Design a protein around this ligand. Structure first.
Ligand code: FES
Ligand code: FES
Lengths: 66, 76
């Protein structure tokens, strides 16, 4: 079975991010679930290239106010 | 049965909602649905988009190092 993350922070044995929305000034955050973003843990659109290259259908998690 | 899978070996999501061409979730920043959430980034959770600890077995089986995203919601 293949790894999901190829290159990101490989000296960390399990990559977890924790954020408190109280701390944010913005109304929206877009988080990467594909492990291909160059701005991980944030989405930079790299998922579209991944989906085309591999036939996948992954995309980000968005946290936002109405 | 098949003992070969000719899909691209680099595919991340193997089984989840394959009728959806791009799986995106959007949740409230405010505590309208929960106080805190732990979101799956490995596409192996049976509770996707929430983490159920499946990442542990995935990391063990593949040598990977992926884990979840923890979001504490803004209390109103
Ligand atoms: S860059 Fe990874 S989900 Fe968008
Ligand atoms: S079950 Fe997928 S990151 Fe925990």
């Amino acid at each position: 079975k293949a790894m999901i993350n190829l290159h990101i922070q490989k000296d960390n044995p399990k990559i977890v991010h924790a954020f408190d929305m109280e701390d944010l000034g913005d109304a929206k955050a877009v988080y990467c679930r594909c492990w291909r973003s160059k701005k991980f843990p944030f989405c930079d659109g790299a998922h579209t290239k991944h989906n085309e290259e591999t036939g996948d259908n992954v995309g980000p998690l968005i946290i936002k106010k109405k």
